[PDB]
């Protein structure tokens, strides 16, 4: 009610929403829905055209509203945007992140998690990091409370994990990699092939991070959309 400021500090307020226009967002190819939202960006003119900012921004959106399935209430993906059309905003994959609620919801006591990081490069020369997490399977019809794998057994599990993710992510392009990440084929094959060393309760890939994209090609970027 009473102000607090110093002498001559409140400038005359200008309306900031005259200079703002909306832009619908379309998702790339392998996701089920395409219209995902709307972004309020500044009005374009000379001295910083707004398409530079639209090339700069990224979005973070969950997978439930993309696949229309609430099985994926976790695994928030990130979408860069590099292209613009008329009242449109075409996007591309940038990363895939869990929610910290599920990261707390997976860790139990008296069982081992095994973490593995790889820096793998796809055939389209995108470098990316894959962070996989894998919790140890408590075998039914057992009595002992702690399902501890030995340390050498953990090292063998991590070696097989990095071998699987390298051999099944080095061969495909980025669109096929996202199409394999969506129903979690990688974690299923790690679960299938590590059970001769120590059975694992659940293998997920908890993070995907795209580090460098050396190409801007509208041909493949529009072949997505």
């Amino acid at each position: 009610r009473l102000s607090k400021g110093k002498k001559g500090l409140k400038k005359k307020v200008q309306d900031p929403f005259t200079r703002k226009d909306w832009y619908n967002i379309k998702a790339p190819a392998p996701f089920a829905v395409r219209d995902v939202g709307k972004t309020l960006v500044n009005r374009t003119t000379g001295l910083k055209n707004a398409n530079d900012a639209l090339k700069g921004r990224i979005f973070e959106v969950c997978l439930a509203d993309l696949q229309k399935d609430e099985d994926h209430a976790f695994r928030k993906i990130k979408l860069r945007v590099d292209e613009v059309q008329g009242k449109n905003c075409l996007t591309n994959f940038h990363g895939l992140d869990f929610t910290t609620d599920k990261l707390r919801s997976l860790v139990r006591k008296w069982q081992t998690l095994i973490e593995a990081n790889v820096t793998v490069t796809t055939t389209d020369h995108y470098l990316l990091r894959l962070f996989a997490i894998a919790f140890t399977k408590r075998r039914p019809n057992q009595i002992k409370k702690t399902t501890y794998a030995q340390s050498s057994q953990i090292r063998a599990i991590r070696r097989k994990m990095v071998e699987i993710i390298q051999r099944e992510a080095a061969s495909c392009t980025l669109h096929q990699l996202v199409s394999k990440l969506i129903p979690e084929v990688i974690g299923r094959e790690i679960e299938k092939a590590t059970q001769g060393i120590y059975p694992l309760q659940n293998v997920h890939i908890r993070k995907v991070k795209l580090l460098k994209q050396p190409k801007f090609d509208l041909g493949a970027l529009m072949a997505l959309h």
Partner: protein, 115 residues
């Protein structure tokens, strides 16, 4: 239903009701907690959060988004990792005045090793 992303920074000293678009870049409207209460003691209070959420929901319904995805956080580096009263009271007032809520997530900065 145009989903805007509401960052609610609920600390013990002041609450920040902040509304952005889906990007995170362009702030639509923010009302801090202390600009609605004359007392710095009661700056972080459920009444302050209720007033801030009512003003933010009024501005965003004048702009016509009428749907929010709410991300709640607190001081998380060496802080408390728990939201103050501002989070509960702001979410209550925000959905009590219109504003179909979408996805709720508590995105607190959790250090892997701080000090």
């Amino acid at each position: 239903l145009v989903f805007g992303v509401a960052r609610i920074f609920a600390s013990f000293n002041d609450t920040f009701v902040h509304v952005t678009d889906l990007s995170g870049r362009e702030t639509i409207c923010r009302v801090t907690g202390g600009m609605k209460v004359k007392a710095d003691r009661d700056e972080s209070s459920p009444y302050a959060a209720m007033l801030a959420a009512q003003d933010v929901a009024a501005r965003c319904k004048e702009l016509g988004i009428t749907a929010l995805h709410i991300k709640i956080r607190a001081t998380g580096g060496n802080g408390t990792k728990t939201p103050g009263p501002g989070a509960q009271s702001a979410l209550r007032a925000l959905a009590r005045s219109g504003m179909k809520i979408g996805r709720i997530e508590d995105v607190t900065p959790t250090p892997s090793d701080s000090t």
